[PDB]
Amino acid sequence: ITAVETRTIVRFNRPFLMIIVDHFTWSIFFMSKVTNPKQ
Amino acid sequence: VDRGLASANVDFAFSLYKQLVLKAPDKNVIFSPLSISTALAFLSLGAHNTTLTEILKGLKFNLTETSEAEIHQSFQHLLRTLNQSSDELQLSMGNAMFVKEQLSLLDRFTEDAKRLYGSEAFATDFQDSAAAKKLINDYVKNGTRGKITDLIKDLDSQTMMVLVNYIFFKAKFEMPFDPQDTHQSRFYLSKKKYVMVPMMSLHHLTIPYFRDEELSCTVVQLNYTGNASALFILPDQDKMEEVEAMLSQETLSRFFDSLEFREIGELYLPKFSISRDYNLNDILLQLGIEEAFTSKADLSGITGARNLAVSQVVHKAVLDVFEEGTERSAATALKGPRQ
Incomplete structure (x- = not known):
C-alpha cells in the first residue's frame, strides 16, 4: 500500500444524475436520477 | 429551425423529468425522453385539429416556428442514425404498430409511418389477449436484447391499435x-x-x-x-x-x-442495475396532451373515422452500470x- 496527496476525488456515493444528450439535435436519449442503486 | 427543434427537445425532457420527480420524490427516475416523444410524434401522424396541435405542443414544439414536416423530418433524420453496431457500441431503435386483425388503415398514415418512422406493421388478434401480449412483449424483448420483457401488463379485448417504440444502448x-x-x-x-x-x-x-x-x-x-x-x-x-x-x-x-x-x-x-415503469397518462395530461385521451380524440388520420383514442401510455426503462460499460x-x- 501507498499514500498519495491528490487534488480531486469524485465520489458517487450519494444521489446523482446521468443525462445522455445527442450532439446535433440535443435530443435526450436517456436520463436518470439514481437515489438508491439497490432498489 | 434546428435551434428551435433543439430547444423543444430539452424542454420536453426536463419538463417530463420535473413531473416524474413530483409524482415520486426520492425514488429513482429512469426514462427515455426520445422513446416517449417518438411514439407520440408517430401517433400524431394520424391526428387532426386540436388533438394534433396538443400533441406537438406537449412535446414542446412551437408550430409558429417549425412546421409539422420539419418536426417529422427531424425524427426521421435522427432515427436513421439509431441502428448501428460498431466498436463495441450498439444502438438500436424500432417503431411498430400492432393493428387489430382486419382493421384497415389510411394509406397516407401507413406510408408516412414507414417513410418517417421506419414503422413496422403487425396484424394482431386482440381478442386473444394472452397471445397479443406475448406478441408485443416479444417484439420489445427482441429489440432490447432481453432487457425489457413485460412492457405490456394488461391489454383490453377491445384494443384497436398499439404503437410501440423501443431504444437499446450498450457500450464499453x-x-x-x-x-x-x-x-x-x-x-x-x-x-x-x-x-x-x-x-x-x-x-x-x-x-x-x-x-x-x-x-x-x-x-x-x-x-x-x-x-x-x-x-x-x-x-x-x-x-x-x-x-x-x-x-x-x-x-x-x-x-x-x-x-x-x-x-x-x-x-x-457504483455498479448497479435499476429499472422503472410508468403509466404516463397523468403526466402527459399535465403537459397538455388532453384530447387524445378522450372521446374528443380526433385520430381519424389513422382509420378514416374518429373511432380511436389513447387509453394508456406506458413506459419502462432499465439502466445497467458495470465495470466494462453500460446498458440502457x-x-x-x-x-x-x-x-
Whole structure:
C-alpha cells in the first residue's frame, strides 16, 4: 500500500444524475436520477 | 429551425423529468425522453385539429416556428442514425404498430409511418389477449436484447391499435473499471440512512470535469467506445433539489462549455442495475396532451373515422452500470381502444 496527496476525488456515493444528450439535435436519449442503486 | 427543434427537445425532457420527480420524490427516475416523444410524434401522424396541435405542443414544439414536416423530418433524420453496431457500441431503435386483425388503415398514415418512422406493421388478434401480449412483449424483448420483457401488463379485448417504440444502448467504457478495484462501500440515501453497494473505482485518470460552485455540484463526462459519452452530475449532499431547480438547456449548455480535461486522483461509481415503469397518462395530461385521451380524440388520420383514442401510455426503462460499460434500454407503448 501507498499514500498519495491528490487534488480531486469524485465520489458517487450519494444521489446523482446521468443525462445522455445527442450532439446535433440535443435530443435526450436517456436520463436518470439514481437515489438508491439497490432498489 | 434546428435551434428551435433543439430547444423543444430539452424542454420536453426536463419538463417530463420535473413531473416524474413530483409524482415520486426520492425514488429513482429512469426514462427515455426520445422513446416517449417518438411514439407520440408517430401517433400524431394520424391526428387532426386540436388533438394534433396538443400533441406537438406537449412535446414542446412551437408550430409558429417549425412546421409539422420539419418536426417529422427531424425524427426521421435522427432515427436513421439509431441502428448501428460498431466498436463495441450498439444502438438500436424500432417503431411498430400492432393493428387489430382486419382493421384497415389510411394509406397516407401507413406510408408516412414507414417513410418517417421506419414503422413496422403487425396484424394482431386482440381478442386473444394472452397471445397479443406475448406478441408485443416479444417484439420489445427482441429489440432490447432481453432487457425489457413485460412492457405490456394488461391489454383490453377491445384494443384497436398499439404503437410501440423501443431504444437499446450498450457500450464499453473507453477506460474500463478494473473489477479488482470494486469494493463494498456505503451509498448515502440521505442524512438518516445509507446502503451498501459495490463501488467501482478508477485511479489517476484524466476526464472532462467541471466543478459548479453555484449549484454545488460536480459534473463529469465518462466516455464510451464509438464516440459515445454520458454526462454525470453529482450534487453535494442535500443539494439535489438545487440542481433540479436549475435544469434547462442553458444550464446543460453551460456544463458542456465548462468541461475541462482534469487529472482526477480517484473516481468512485457504483455498479448497479435499476429499472422503472410508468403509466404516463397523468403526466402527459399535465403537459397538455388532453384530447387524445378522450372521446374528443380526433385520430381519424389513422382509420378514416374518429373511432380511436389513447387509453394508456406506458413506459419502462432499465439502466445497467458495470465495470466494462453500460446498458440502457427503454420502450413506450400507446394503447388505443375502440370508441
